Write a protein that binds this ligand. Structure first.
Ligand SMILES: Cc1cc(=O)c2ccccc2[nH]1
Ligand SMILES: [K+]
Ligand SMILES: [K+]
Length: 273
């Protein structure tokens, strides 16, 4: 992209997006999920580019040139993200995550505190403990014989029977160059994160300093899913959700306008005390 930079972060060389917009805070920090890069945010960046400083960190072995790296998890993602934020001299940021980027967002909210990271937005992140089908997929991702088969079953779930041109391009073209190294790592970390933390909702409830977090999602579409978000929202003043009605698990791609108004609303709220 026009905005794609690269820096040394401890051992590893990481690419990141930085639009270097010279404007009022907070910074908008878009956090990739596993085994994809800033390319998932190219439509979202367009919505935000003019009115905000937009930062997109790419994880170790993630970017236009995927490469094998030493095993790491979401704690390393936080430190990696914070190291890029120190080098860019960014203080106050609004983290916005996609899917299992959420583990990075919540740990980041903890480690940075409510002053630097006063709110967060989590997009299409499975709020409940893995269901058998998702549990099955992590299995396949972790198996060096069937990891690719694992990715294809997930692609089926994320597209939800839609011929959605932009999302299909993301999955089959922009994730094509990611291998078992990444997809195997993704299965290991996400499985461990649900195992260790219970769920995203347990992790968020467990924060030392609870904060405005909004879950914005299109999937899953079933009533039972909306109710756990609704019940959690009832129990926690700080939690809200928005069902975006988009066709796929990638609203950043297929309803970027809708993603942006929620991001903008949280950005506005931050700018006003
Ligand atoms: C980009 C992306 C989205 C996901 O929901 C996911 C889940 C498991 C493994 C890898 C993954 N990768
Ligand atoms: K279509
Ligand atoms: K609430």
């Amino acid at each position: 992209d026009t905005y794609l930079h690269e820096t040394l972060v401890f051992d590893n060389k990481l690419s990141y997006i930085d639009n270097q917009r010279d404007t009022d805070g907070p910074a908008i920090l878009l956090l990739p999920g596993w085994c994809h890069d800033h390319r998932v945010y190219k439509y979202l960046i367009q919505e935000l580019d003019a009115d905000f400083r937009v930062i997109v960190p790419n994880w170790r072995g993630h970017g236009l040139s995927p490469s094998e790296v030493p095993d790491f998890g979401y704690q390393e993602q936080v430190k990696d993200a914070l190291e890029i934020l120190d080098q860019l001299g960014v203080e106050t940021f609004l983290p916005v995550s996609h899917s299992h980027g959420g583990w990075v967002l919540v740990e980041l909210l903890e480690q940075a505190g409510p002053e630097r990271a006063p709110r967060g937005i989590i997009m299409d992140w499975l709020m409940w403990a893995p269901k058998p089908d998702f549990a099955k997929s992590l299995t396949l991702l972790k198996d060096p014989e069937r990891w690719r088969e694992g990715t294809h079953g997930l692609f089926d779930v994320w597209l939800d029977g839609h011929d959605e041109k932009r999302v299909r391009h993301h999955l089959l073209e922009e994730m094509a160059d990611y291998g078992y190294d990444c997809w195997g790592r993704s299965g290991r970390v996400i499985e461990d994160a649900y195992g260790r933390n219970g769920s995203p909702m347990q992790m968020m409830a467990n924060l030392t300093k609870t904060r405005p977090i909004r879950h914005i999602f299109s999937q899953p579409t079933e009533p039972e899913y909306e109710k756990i978000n609704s019940d959690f929202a009832e129990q926690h003043p700080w939690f809200s959700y928005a069902k975006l009605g988009g066709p796929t698990a990638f609203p950043a791609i297929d309803v970027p306008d809708r993603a942006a108004v929620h991001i903008r609303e949280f950005a506005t709220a931050i700018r006003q005390g």
